[PDB]
Amino acid sequence: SHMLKLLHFATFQNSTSVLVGGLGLLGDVKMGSLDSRTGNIRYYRPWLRPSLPKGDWDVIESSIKSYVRDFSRLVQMYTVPYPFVFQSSIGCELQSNGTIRTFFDIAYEGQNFLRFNLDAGTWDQMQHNQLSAKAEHLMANASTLNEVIQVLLNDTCVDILRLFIQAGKADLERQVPPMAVVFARTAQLLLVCRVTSFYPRPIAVTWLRDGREVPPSPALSTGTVLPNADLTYQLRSTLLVSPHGYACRVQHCSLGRSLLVPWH
Amino acid sequence: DLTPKVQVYSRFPASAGTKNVLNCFAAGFHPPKISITLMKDGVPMEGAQYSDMSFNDDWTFQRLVHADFTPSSGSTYACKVEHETLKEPQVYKWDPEF
Numbered sequence: 001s002h003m004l005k006l007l008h009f010a011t012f013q014n015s016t017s018v019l020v021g022g023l024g025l026l027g028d029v030k031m032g033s034l035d036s037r038t039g040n041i042r043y044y045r046p047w048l049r050p051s052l053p054k055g056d057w058d059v060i061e062s063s064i065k066s067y068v069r070d071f072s073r074l075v076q077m078y079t080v081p082y083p084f085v086f087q088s089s090i091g092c093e094l095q096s097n098g099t100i101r102t103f104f105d106i107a108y109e110g111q112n113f114l115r116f117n118l119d120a121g122t123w124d125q126m127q128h129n130q131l132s133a134k135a136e137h138l139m140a141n142a143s144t145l146n147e148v149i150q151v152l153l154n155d156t157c158v159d160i161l162r163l164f165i166q167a168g169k170a171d172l173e174r175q176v177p178p179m180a181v182v183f184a185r186t187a188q189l190l191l192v193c194r195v196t197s198f199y200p201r202p203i204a205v206t207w208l209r210d211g212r213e214v215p216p217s218p219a220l221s222t223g224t225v226l227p228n229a230d231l232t233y234q235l236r237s238t239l240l241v242s243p244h245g246y247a248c249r250v251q252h253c254s255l256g257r258s259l260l261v262p263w264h
Numbered sequence: 265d266l267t268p269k270v271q272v273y274s275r276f277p278a279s280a281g282t283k284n285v286l287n288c289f290a291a292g293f294h295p296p297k298i299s300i301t302l303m304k305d306g307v308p309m310e311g312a313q314y315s316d317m318s319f320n321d322d323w324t325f326q327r328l329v330h331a332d333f334t335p336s337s338g339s340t341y342a343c344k345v346e347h348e349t350l351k352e353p354q355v356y357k358w359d360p361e362f
């Protein structure tokens with residue numbers, strides 16, 4: 001599975017002022033972003049620019065900048081009091097299947113507000129209120145744009161995806177092994193397994209009691225995955241125990257075989 | 265709106281006099297405007313770098329702030345966060361075990 005995702009957001013501060021940002025992602029690899037001051041696209045990965053000719057880049061940049069500009073203009077024209085925020089998430093995903101999933105969602109005040117329907121080439125209203133109803137009817141009226149959106153999502157996004165999978169294969173296939181320590185915190189005792197340095201993000205950290213997986217309960221917290229700045233990840237998992245043998249088990253694709261760290 | 269959820273943690277298990285990176289990650293917040301400042305002994309840390317603002321599949325914004333550091337015994341480290349959901353700036357101390 002691979003995914004190409006473009007993210008955009010906009011805070012409308014008043015009728016003439018809007019702070020925009022945007023990001024391009026290939027899985028969790030940041031391809032580039034939108035300079036929130038000049039609006040010029042910045043490219044973060046060296047394989048990007050040579051993967052397409054200049055003319056294609058020019059069309060991509062101009063379409064991004066028109067999208068952003070037209071978005072702000074539509075909102076100001078048709079809205080509801082300042083300040084508020086819109087977001088977009090636009091892209092496609094390729095399974096190993098060969099199966100394509102496309103997405104084009106707009107959020108408003110942090111909730112799904114409009115969603116593109118690829119097969120019908122129209123818009124689904126996502127909020128049960130007048131603003132979302134208006135937006136849906138307005139966008140339903142743009143037949144030609146919607147025909148073009150269908151091709152952008154189903155053909156051009158996918159084609160660029162396939163090509164980016166090949167051009168950026170080094171990023172995508174990069175792996176970094178986890179490092180893990182176990183220590184106890186005063187509590188009962190709270191055992192902590194802290195894992196860092198791993199890439200890619202999927203991982204399985206479990207506790208063993210005498211070689212046996214401790215089942216889920218409120219005694220066992222597995223935390224949430226946290227990012228490091230060098231595009232690796234960190235996790236902490238804990239187990240409330242009473243002073244059995246305990247070890248933390250870390251399974252990760254960089255390992256094929258798992259990391260086993262005993263509590264001492 | 266949604267108040268930020270903040271974690272402060274180092275890149276590696278910390279050790280006095282050993283080079284490391286201090287991370288402050290704010291997440292789950294809305295609107296995106298927020299100040300995040302890594303602090304050492306009550307003052308902003310030098311060398312702080314700010315990730316691009318981004319948001320997760322459920323639309324909540326997040327940001328990672330990080331700085332190279334060499335923790336020493338006796339210094340204290342924190343991340344200070346201002347967001348409109350907060351009546352005042354909130355100081356999250358680094359627990360040198362995390």
Ligand SMILES: *[C@@H]1O[C@H](CO)[C@@H](O)[C@H](O)[C@H]1NC(C)=O
Pocket residue numbers: 013014015016017
């Ligand atoms: C809109 O916002 C900006 C910056 O906050 C300000 O400089 C500008 O004059 C504002 N416009 C109005 C009509 O208040």
Ligand SMILES: *[C@@H]1O[C@H](CO)[C@@H](O)[C@H](O)[C@H]1NC(C)=O
Pocket residue numbers: 100118119154
């Ligand atoms: C999307 O693309 C594939 C061809 O690559 C096609 O079989 C499928 O029907 C397309 N769906 C739409 C709505 O165009």
Ligand SMILES: *[C@@H]1O[C@H](CO)[C@@H](O)[C@H](O)[C@H]1NC(C)=O
Pocket residue numbers: 134137138141
């Ligand atoms: C869509 O177009 C119709 C007829 O062309 C028009 O009367 C209507 O107001 C439009 N709907 C919106 C929301 O603009």
Ligand SMILES: [Cl-]
Pocket residue numbers: 228229230275285
């Ligand atoms: Cl780092």
